Amino acid sequence: TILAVDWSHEERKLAIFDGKKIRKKLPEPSSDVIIVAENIPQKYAAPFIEVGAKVLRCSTNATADARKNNDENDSKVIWALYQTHPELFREMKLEPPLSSYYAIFKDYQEVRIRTGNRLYSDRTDAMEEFFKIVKKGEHELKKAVDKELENHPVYTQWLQHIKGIGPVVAGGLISLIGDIDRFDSVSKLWAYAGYSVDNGKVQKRKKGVASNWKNKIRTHCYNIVDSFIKQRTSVYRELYDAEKARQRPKVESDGHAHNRAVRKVAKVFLQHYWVVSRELAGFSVSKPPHWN
Amino acid sequence: TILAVDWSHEERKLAIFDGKKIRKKLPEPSSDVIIVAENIPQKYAAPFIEVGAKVLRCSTNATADARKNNDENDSKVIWALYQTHPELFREMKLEPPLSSYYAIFKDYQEVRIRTGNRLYSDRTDAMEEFFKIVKKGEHELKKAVDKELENHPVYTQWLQHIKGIGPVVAGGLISLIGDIDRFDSVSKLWAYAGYSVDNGKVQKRKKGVASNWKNKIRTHCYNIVDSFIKQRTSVYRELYDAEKARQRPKVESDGHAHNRAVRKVAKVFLQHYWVVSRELAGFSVSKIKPPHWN
RNA sequence: AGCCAUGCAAGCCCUGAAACCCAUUGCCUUAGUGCG
DNA sequence: AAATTGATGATTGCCTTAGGGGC
DNA sequence: TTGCATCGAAACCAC
DNA sequence: GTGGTTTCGATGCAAGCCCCTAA
DNA sequence: GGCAATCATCAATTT
Ligand SMILES: [Mg+2]
Ligand SMILES: [Mg+2]
Ligand SMILES: [Mg+2]
Ligand SMILES: [Mg+2]
């Protein structure tokens, strides 16, 4: 039994299509059902995953990009795209609780940075006590991430031992990438992260064009590489020096060779994160420093 | 003694042109010195304001738009702009403490909205405890704004009596506009606020074109009129209904007539705010009479 | 008096061969001046 | 006299793109 | 796909 | 038995652009 | 016109 859902929070908007008729509300969960949606939240879908009722999702751009060629008709388009382009739809899986702690950590940190910048701009005690409370929340949730990482083998067995990696690098890298059966090649992970290349051209933001990578992992990798640089970490600092020397003959100012070296190291680190996680979880393979 | 300063926070970047040579640092404050700058912070200008040293500032776009016709040379360009078009330069004045409380209030409110929206998207004990702390801060600063408004004649003598006006509406309107002596006509305030009309076209944001109005006062005015609409406030609700009815024959949907009526009411309210603030401060009058003002 | 269409923010999503090809962001403050 | 919290040294440059659309 | 922008009045609460 | 704090009702609509640049 | 992105090391502080 396939059902296509045009999701919403407001029950007036919701619609479901069985391929023949339209329904206004969802059933009780059962593993006879496969659900397909254009990005339904885990808030609504977790009851189904919790009983083995599969949920498949596709990008919020998939229908808009089919339309280059009422709302309730869009449930029919979602159903039609599941029939015509079943390669797009990917299985939603229930998250680990680390991803929640890391989310709340970054939700506190942006409030902390936001508050620090105002303390730079002019000084008042109200924001200084707030800054202290927000710093405590950020600290306690870093300690929560630190605690939860004990349940994450790729940290305790590997990322813990790399000099210049600690709880926040690993908390972000884990939760932003997630289950490593989602990426059947290293290049799928680079493409998802924003490190792929077409004809020698990088992925850049461009107004009026939807992006197709999770840019937060490329922003995160920037800080992982920044740490490798400042700590002079093992294999990875050597690779930075080697590339930064190799590339400066080819580019017009030092900062371009720097950005190219950073990109090179971030890509090779993601290759190693892939390799180690695939070997840990028992997925197919196709050097990291500490891993043997 | 005129000095043109290309201001900065880091003293390595600071540059001043005295009309003959480039200097790296400012002199001791004296009313003999007139400073001209492109948006210098109050942090750096306040020592001069307290000693009567006039500080004149111009829009950060004035030089960029003049160039349409070393890096330290910009200190000279400011000097050149002050010499050729001194009308672009306006006297900076030390802000009232109300503006600080309102700024901190809006900083807390935006953190509250941000946190409540996260609570809507996901529920966690961490953010609920935080949401309660942030709400407390917003509440205490609302009381701080409310308390500071006692020192503002335009509040206690006029805006306080209008149904639908309280401490946040009035605090925002006062601090966003600042001194009303900056606008010699109601049309100047409409232009600065974003309500002016050119050959029948309104001011709209536009990629690649620097705006020339303080859009935050137009966003605030939207809430002032929204308050009048929900409360059915006297003169202003009548004006809203009358204009929305007069305009609906000329537009294709109810929402467009609504936006035109809202704009009309906002402009009339700003005209009354201008008039009352001018009379309270003792400035010249010009030109519906305000409701509670006599 | 006519002419006349305020924004801010949150959540989530994204899928090039392991050479070579190869330029991450998120914020903060402040400014802005129609006609008779 | 150990666990927790604080401080601050580690390096690295200085374009444009201002910047994703969508649910 | 969402929630927010404010005040005025009725009710609840503590001391 | 008052001063202060909480909850909630009022009213209006479903474009169009997301759409400021500068110090 | 500004800041932040985090980890490692040495030390100070409370308990
Ligand atoms: Mg939909
Ligand atoms: Mg978040
Ligand atoms: Mg400058
Ligand atoms: Mg602010």
Long-range pairs of A170-173 with CB within 8 A, sequence gap ≥ 24: A171/A98, A171/A101, A171/A102, A171/A105, A171/A145, A172/A102, A172/A106, A172/A220, A173/A217, A173/A220, A173/A224, A173/A273
Check if residue B231 sits with its Cβ under 7 angstroms from strand E.
Answer: yes
Residue B179's identity, in one-letter code, is D
- 3-class secondary structure for chain B? CEEEEECCCCCCCCEEECCCCEECCCCCCCCCCEEEECCCCHHHHHHHHCCCCCEEECCCCHHHHHCCCCHHHHHHHHHHHHHHCHHHCEECCCCCHHHHHHHHHHHHHHHHHHHHHHHHHCCCHHHHHHHHHHHHHHHHHHHHHHHHHHHCHHHHHHHCCCCCCCHHHHHHHHHHHCCHHHCCCHHHHHHHHCCCEECCEECCCCCCCCCCCCHHHHHHHHHHHHHHHHHCCHHHHHHHHHHHHHHHHHCCCHHHHHHHHHHHHHHHHHHHHHHHHHHHHCCCCCCCCCCCCC
- The Cα–Cα gap between B89 and A9 comes to 52
A2-6/A197-198 β-pairing = unpaired
- The Cα–Cα gap between B261 and B246 comes to 9
- 3-class secondary structure for A133-180? HHHHHHHHHHHHHHHHHHHCHHHHHHHCCCCCCCHHHHHHHHHHHCCH
- The Cα–Cα gap between B186 and B270 comes to 8
CB–CB contacts below 8 A, A to B:
30
Residue A213's identity, in one-letter code, is W
**C-alpha of residue A140 to centroid of ligand 2, in Å:** 17
List the beta bridge partners of residue B35. B3, B55
Cβ atoms of A145 and A167 within 8 Å: the answer is: yes
CA distances from A138 to A97, A133, A291, B114 (A): 17, 9, 31, 16
Residue of A nearest to B119 (CA): A104
Report chain B's C-alpha Rg in angstroms.
22
- The Cα–Cα gap between B126 and B233 comes to 41
Neighbours of A256 (CB within 10 A): 13
- The Cα–Cα gap between B150 and B285 comes to 25
> Of A43, A124, A133, which is closest to B104 when you measure between CB atoms?
A124
- The Cα–Cα gap between B294 and B288 comes to 13
Angle at B109 between CA B104 and CA B110, to 5 degrees: 100
End-to-end CA distance of chain B: 46
Q: Which two tokens stand for residue B130?
A: 């935080």
Q: Which residue has the tokens 């004296």?
A: B30
| Distance of residue B258 Cα from the nearest chain A Cα, in angstroms | 24
Residue of B nearest to A128 (CA): B104
- The Cα–Cα gap between B102 and B98 comes to 6
**C-alpha of residue A263 to centroid of ligand 2, in Å:** 25
Does the distance separating the beta carbons of A124 and B107 come in below 8 Å? no
Check if residue B266 sits with its Cβ under 7 angstroms from strand E.
Answer: no
A100 inside 8 A of chain B by CB: yes
Q: Which two tokens stand for residue A157?
A: 């067995």
Q: Among residues B72, B85, B84, which one has the least CA distance to residue B16?
A: B72
A54-57/A90-91 β-pairing = antiparallel
Is residue A184 a known part of a binding site? no
Resolution in angstroms for this experimental structure?
3.0
CA distances from A78 to A14, A58, A66, A191 (A): 13, 9, 10, 25
> Strand G: which positions are within 7 A of a protein CB?
1-9
* Structural domain boundaries in chain A: 2-91, 152-281
Is residue A6 a known part of a binding site? yes
Residue of A nearest to B110 (CA): A111
- The Cα–Cα gap between B126 and A22 comes to 40
Check if residue A149 sits with its Cβ under 7 angstroms from strand G.
Answer: no
| Distance of residue B87 Cα from the nearest chain A Cα, in angstroms | 29
CA distances from B235 to A209, B192, B289 (A): 48, 25, 9
Footprint of strand D on the protein (CB under 7 A): A 6-7, 38-39, 59-61, 63-64, 143, 204-212, 215, 229-232, 244, 253-259; B 207
- 3-class secondary structure for chain A? CEEEEECCCCCCCCEEECCCCEECCCCCCCCCCEEEECCCCHHHHHHHHCCCCEEEECCCCHHHHHCCCCCCHHHHHHHHHHHHCCCCCEECCCCCCHHHHHHHHHHHHHHHHHHHHHHHHCCCHHHHHHHHHHHHHHHHHHHHHHHHHHHCHHHHHHHCCCCCCCHHHHHHHHHHHCCHHHCCCHHHHHHHHCCCEECCEECCCCCCCCCCCCHHHHHHHHHHHHHHHHHCCHHHHHHHHHHHHHHHHHCCCHHHHHHHHHHHHHHHHHHHHHHHHHHHHCCCCCCCCCCC
B128 inside 8 A of chain A by CB: no
> Of B111, B124, B141, which is closest to A104 when you measure between CB atoms?
B124
Q: How many Å apart are B85 CA and C27 C1'? A: 35
Breaks in chain B (C–N beyond 2.5 Å) sit after 69, 287
- The Cα–Cα gap between B290 and B282 comes to 17
| Phi, psi angle pair for A132, to nearest 5° | -65, -40
Q: Which two tokens stand for residue A69?
A: 């060629």
Cβ atoms of A102 and A145 within 8 Å: the answer is: yes
**C-alpha of residue B234 to centroid of ligand 2, in Å:** 44
Provide the CA A264 distance to its chain's centre, in angstroms.
Answer: 20
Q: CA dihedral in degrees (A99, A104, A109, A115; nearest 10)? A: 160
List the beta bridge partners of residue A5. A16, A37
